Amino acid sequence: FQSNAMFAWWGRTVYQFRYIVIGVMVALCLGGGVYGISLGNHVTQSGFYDEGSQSVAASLIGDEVYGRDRTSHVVAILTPPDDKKVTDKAWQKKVTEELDQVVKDHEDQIVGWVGWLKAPDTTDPTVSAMKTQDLRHTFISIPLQGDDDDEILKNYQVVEPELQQVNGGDIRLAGLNPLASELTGTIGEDQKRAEVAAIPLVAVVLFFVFGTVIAAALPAIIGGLAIAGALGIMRLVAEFTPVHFFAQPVVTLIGLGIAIDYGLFIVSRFREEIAEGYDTEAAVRRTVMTSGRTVVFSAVIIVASSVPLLLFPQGFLKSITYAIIASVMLAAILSITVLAAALAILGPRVDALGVTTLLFWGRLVNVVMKRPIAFAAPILVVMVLLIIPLGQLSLGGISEKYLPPDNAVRQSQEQFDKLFPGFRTEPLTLVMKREDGEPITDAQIADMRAKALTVSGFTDPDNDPEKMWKERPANDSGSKDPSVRVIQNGLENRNDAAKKIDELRALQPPHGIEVFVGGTPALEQDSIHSLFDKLPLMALILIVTTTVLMFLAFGSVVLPIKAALMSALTLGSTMGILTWMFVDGHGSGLMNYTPQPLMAPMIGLIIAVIWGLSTDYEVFLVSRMVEARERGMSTAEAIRIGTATTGRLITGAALILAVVAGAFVFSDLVMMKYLAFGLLIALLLDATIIRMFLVPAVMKLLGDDCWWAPRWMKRVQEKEFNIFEMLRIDEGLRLKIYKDTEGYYTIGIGHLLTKSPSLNAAKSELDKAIGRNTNGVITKDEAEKLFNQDVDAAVRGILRNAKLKPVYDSLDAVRRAALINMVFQMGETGVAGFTNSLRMLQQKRWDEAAVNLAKSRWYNQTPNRAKRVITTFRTGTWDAYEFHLGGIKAFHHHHHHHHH
Ligand SMILES: CCCCCCCCCCCCOC[C@H]1O[C@H](O[C@H]2O[C@H](CO)[C@@H](O)[C@H](O)[C@H]2O)[C@H](O)[C@@H](O)[C@@H]1O
Ligand SMILES: CCCCCCCCCCCCOC[C@H]1O[C@H](O[C@H]2O[C@H](CO)[C@@H](O)[C@H](O)[C@H]2O)[C@H](O)[C@@H](O)[C@@H]1O
Ligand SMILES: CCCCCCCCCCCCOC[C@H]1O[C@H](O[C@H]2O[C@H](CO)[C@@H](O)[C@H](O)[C@H]2O)[C@H](O)[C@@H](O)[C@@H]1O
Ligand SMILES: CCCCCCCCCCCCOC[C@H]1O[C@H](O[C@H]2O[C@H](CO)[C@@H](O)[C@H](O)[C@H]2O)[C@H](O)[C@@H](O)[C@@H]1O
Ligand SMILES: CCCCCCCCCCCCOC[C@H]1O[C@H](O[C@H]2O[C@H](CO)[C@@H](O)[C@H](O)[C@H]2O)[C@H](O)[C@@H](O)[C@@H]1O
Ligand SMILES: c1cc2c(s1)CCOC21CCN(Cc2ccc3c(c2)OCCO3)CC1
Ligand SMILES: NC(=O)CN(CC(=O)O)CC(=O)O
Ligand SMILES: NC(=O)CN(CC(=O)O)CC(=O)O
């Protein structure tokens, strides 16, 4: 159930108010860009866990009571120069002084530095392990101030430039915060690689789509305004909800491409409307009423494919979904507001600037429709084989391996673990809270320790069961509430985590004690089960909402059911190739990334993104095919006509987003590589294999049941504009007798009753004409009957005139109505006066014919009606009447008033 009255209204109103539209929208988005370049200072790295999970509650209680663990913030490997040993007291004094100096200057950022180097004469075996036994390396630990991840990372980045100079610059920093800042700086590095390699390439792809500077430049400006405004929207959202770092490149990697593609399509159809003969006002309105609603539907489909991600509790996916929605909706709005008004101002000047300014699909579709199974099956089988790698698949958490294997910080983390094994631990934790409020007695701790010892698989370094599950270290920021106690122990093999936790949760607590299972493996496993638990509902919502929207678009039941599984196939094979690439490792040597399990939220994100991409492209294409079959075309020529006029623009937009995605696949953060490669793969599969070979065959074998419209769930076609409506516009419709501009009694559509002055004689002739006694008033249908009679009289007169019959037989029905209109107005001799223009019309030289007709006295005397009729001759459509300014005030009776 459409409403193009709104799109018609907006296509008119955006032309009317084009200046304030461009002003307001450009102002708002550029202001948003100023507002949102500060977005990078208000994003978070938190959002990978399930903050409603038991392990998160365990972590919160632990950090409250015992104090958050700051021992892993920054580890620094110092090694003396000149192959000196770490017991050199001069080098010891120098480096101790340097470190106390850097701590003295940044006490609001650094808590202090720990390590053997502070007390080199000590008994502590753990502290004495902070030096290698060859005594040429020793590490310190530098805890930082801060009570959330973002604040601690900001403090680390504040003190890092001076910390890095300690010991002649030969100090290697690792730990949570060096790794975190490297991982988060990959974002800015990707944005600049985009800025430098993508925008020239997409600019020249734009210029190859339109061989014109201005037409190519408009979608690029739309994309830039989209990026600016979306960063502004995201900075505004950041003041209510946390927004993840990853939301920033998603604005560029997905937002910019789609905004540019929207601009592509709208400028393309504006140019083609101008080429079809319409003026820039009608051109703007039709561009809106067609491509603007295609892009609005495109935005609705992308939002419908991204929203299910909100089912997941990870703030990561939440903020990414918000970024996608803002980018896409702002892109659509801009493309039918700033871009529409810009085109309304420019007009045909969009093509004024050529390249000189410097300072076939139908053969392909038809080859493959008489040979369908020669491509169908030998493509579906290859795609299911491309999915068989998907069964190979694992998931994991963030690691230093997410950086390239030659990354300095990753390498020093790996050398820290190499030189000092056993410090880096990820214990599971039993956190116990007494419901009531009293301290927890040692009997309860011993009980819980025994019940922890019934379960196998926990590390026992000293081979004494009594001394595993030691109490968590308690520091100066813990409340030390005696009603809460934490014990902890690492796993021998972390692959057992998922089950070990599940059995430690299966333990029954002591009487009056609540126990939460926490620790890094618990957080990761709880988040993985979060995603896996709420993934099926995600997929179902995704699928069925996409297919009901394709019900709305195609007006079919078999075509959406086909496109749904075709897109399921695209998604499956894309993910299979992605797993062959990033888990099995094929491509890891050339691209410089480590083969490893995938981030779990990336699964939901990639499902949503690739699914939305494929159904967006399939709707955009087969849309024109359903319109072809609706425009009398056959199925076959329908598939052909659909692929034909779309091909160039589809491949252009595909190439632009492929360029920016290929800019992003070089990122140092492997999650970025995975997502951008999934984009490239799904793109190249959707733009050629499925688009060219799969859909036309599959829709040929579905012969004519490709459109099955059951019940009243299909678009009936509405009132076709006719000559009655045209001249009701041009001559009015009056149901009561009146006097025209000559004082003659007229009724209906310009129907002269009599030249007599007696209104009663006019009433007599109208009573005779209508068949009843009317007292001077008729109904609408009787007026239509009188008009049909007059039209028949005018056509008979035309076919009787040697000067008019040839051109009249020449013309189509709409242009025939234009000629009958001219005859009605001025007589057949008057119309036959236009010898040259009538010949031009006869020769279908619509352009020159319109030009010559506008040079006439007819145009000068009645420019609005003459202009409408001339436009009808040019375009051969009813556009100049279907949408026009209100009404007319001077009523004059026409020639061929028919009497009987
Ligand atoms: C854009 C892509 C780049 C991705 C960058 C990812 C960098 C990875 C850095 C990992 C930092 C982990 O830090 C270790 C911390 O883990 C837990 O606490 C954390 O988990 C809780 C769940 O809510 C929060 O409440 C706490 O605030 C929060 O610190 C422990 O309780 C803390 O004792 C410990 O110190
Ligand atoms: C992915 C990131 C991986 C990063 C791995 C993290 C590396 C972990 C490094 C942590 C070093 C911990 O060691 C430092 C020592 O702190 C505590 O003692 C504190 O109070 C004592 C007073 O009696 C003083 O003597 C100590 O100097 C003082 O630190 C503990 O009681 C010791 O047991 C522990 O040895
Ligand atoms: C628009 C882009 C869409 C991308 C389409 C999907 C293709 C992605 C790239 C897939 C692998 C590309 O090849 C890149 C890799 O080639 C070789 O290895 C491959 O050839 C060896 C023969 O001995 C075998 O041993 C290895 O298993 C095998 O991976 C090199 O050893 C690697 O240095 C390099 O990384
Ligand atoms: C406070 C501010 C709130 C703003 C609210 C904004 C709501 C956004 C929804 C706007 C309604 C737009 O919906 C699109 C509507 O048009 C579709 O067809 C159109 O796309 C086809 C592609 O195939 C072309 O072929 C057709 O020419 C063309 O008519 C379908 O006919 C309708 O089923 C559908 O509903
Ligand atoms: C179908 C159309 C698709 C068009 C796609 C092309 C459009 C955008 C292409 C932009 C290419 C920019 O340059 C590519 C990259 O070269 C090196 O990369 C590094 O990558 C690995 C990471 O460790 C290691 O191999 C080396 O450190 C080093 O090679 C530079 O260090 C990067 O700064 C630079 O970004
Ligand atoms: C109206 C629509 C279109 C026009 S005019 C021109 C060609 O491109 C489309 C727009 C882009 N779209 C592809 C696409 C790209 C990225 C996506 C995505 C979909 O969906 C989910 C997140 O990321 C295909 C159709
Ligand atoms: N509209 C017309 O045909 C005007 N013609 C009149 C004619 O054909 O004799 C004059 C012209 O072509 O300059
Ligand atoms: N706008 C008017 O009513 C006057 N005119 C219309 C015009 O100037 O084009 C008379 C007509 O319709 O033939």
Swiss-Prot record:
Q: Which source organism?
A: Mycolicibacterium smegmatis (strain ATCC 700084 / mc(2)155) (Mycobacterium smegmatis)
Q: What is the effect of changing I324T?
A: Binds to SQ109, AU1235, ICA38 and rimonabant with a dissociation constant (Kd) values similar to wild-type
Enumerate the residues marked as the site Part of the proton transportation network.
K562, E618
**Signal peptide, first to last residue:** none
Q: Any further remarks?
A: Binds antitubercular compounds N-(4,4-dimethylcyclohexyl)-4,6-difluoro-1H-indole-2-carboxamide (NITD-349) and 1-((2,3-dihydrobenzo[b][1,4]dioxin-6-yl) methyl)-6',7'-dihydrospiro[piperidine-4,4'-thieno[3,2-c]pyran] (SPIRO) with Kd values of 0.05 uM and 0.8 uM, respectively.
Q: Which residues of the full protein are shown?
A: 1 to 748 of 1013
Biotech / industrial applications: This protein is a target of small molecules which can be validated by developed assays that measure the topology of trehalose monomycolate (TMM) in the inner membrane of mycobacterial spheroplasts after which they may be developed to future antituberculosis drugs. Designing improved inhibitors against this protein could be achieved by avoiding direct contacts with the identified residues that can mutate to confer drug resistance.
Q: What happens when the gene is disrupted?
A: Cells lacking this gene are not viable. Knockdown or depletion of this gene leads to accummulation of trehalose monomycolate (TMM) and lack of trehalose dimycolate (TDM). Decrease in mycolylation of arabinogalactan (AG). Accumulates MSMEG_5308 protein.
Instruction: Pull the Cytoplasmic topological domain ranges from the record.
Output: 6-19, 267-295, 560-562, 623-649
Write out the topological domains of type Periplasmic: 41-201, 244-245, 317-322, 394-538, 584-601, 671-674
Q: What is this protein called?
A: Trehalose monomycolate exporter MmpL3
- Tell me what effect the entry lists for T321I: Confers resistance to ICA38
Biological process terms from the Gene Ontology for this record are: cell wall biogenesis; cell wall organization; mycolate cell wall layer assembly; mycolic acid biosynthetic process; phospholipid transport; regulation of membrane potential; response to antibiotic; response to xenobiotic stimulus
What does the entry list under GO cellular component? cell pole; cell septum; cell tip; plasma membrane
Site feature Part of the proton-transportation channel: at which residues?
D261, Y262, D616, Y617
What family, per the record?
Belongs to the resistance-nodulation-cell division (RND) (TC 2.A.6) family. MmpL subfamily.
Impact after mutating S298A: Growth defect in both liquid and solid media; confers resistance to SQ109 and AU1235 with 4-fold and 33-fold increased resistance, respectively; disrupted membrane potential; no significant difference in cell wall hydrophobicity; more sensitive to ampicillin and the hydrophobic antibiotics, rifampicin and erythromycin, but no change in sensitivity to chloramphenicol or kanamycin, compared to wild-type
Q: Name one GO molecular function term.
A: trehalose transmembrane transporter activity
Which residues are listed for SQ109 binding in this entry?
Answer: D616
Q: What happens on changing Y262C?
A: Growth defect in both liquid and solid media; confers resistance to SQ109 and AU1235 with 2-fold and 4-fold increased resistance, respectively; disrupted membrane potential; increased cell wall hydrophobicity; more sensitive to ampicillin and the hydrophobic antibiotics, rifampicin and erythromycin, but no change in sensitivity to chloramphenicol or kanamycin, compared to wild-type
Q: What are the record keywords, sorted?
A: Cell inner membrane, Cell membrane, Cell wall biogenesis/degradation, Lipid transport, Membrane, Transmembrane, Transmembrane helix, Transport
The Basic and acidic residues compositionally biased stretches are 464-483
Where would you find this protein in the cell? Cell inner membrane; Cell septum; Cell tip
Q: What is the effect of changing V659G?
A: Binds to ICA38 with a dissociation constant (Kd) value similar to wild-type
Q: Which residues cross the membrane?
A: 20-40, 202-222, 223-243, 246-266, 296-316, 323-343, 373-393, 539-559, 563-583, 602-622, 650-670, 675-695
Q: Which residues of this UniProt protein bind a 1,2-diacylglycero-3-phosphoethanolamine?
A: Q45, S46, G47, F48, Y49
Activity regulation, in the record's words, is:
Inhibited by the antimycobacterial compound BM212, a pyrrole derivative. Inhibited by the antitubercular drug SQ109. Inhibited by the adamantyl urea derivative AU1235, the indole carboxamide ICA38 and rimonabant, the antagonist for the cannabinoid receptor CB1. The dissociation constant (Kd) values for SQ109, AU1235, ICA38 and rimonabant are 1.65 uM, 0.29, 0.16 and 29.5, respectively. Inhibitory effects are due to binding of the inhibitors at the proton-transportation channel most likely dissipating the transmembrane electrochemical proton gradient needed for substrate translocation.
Disulfide-bond pairs as recorded: none
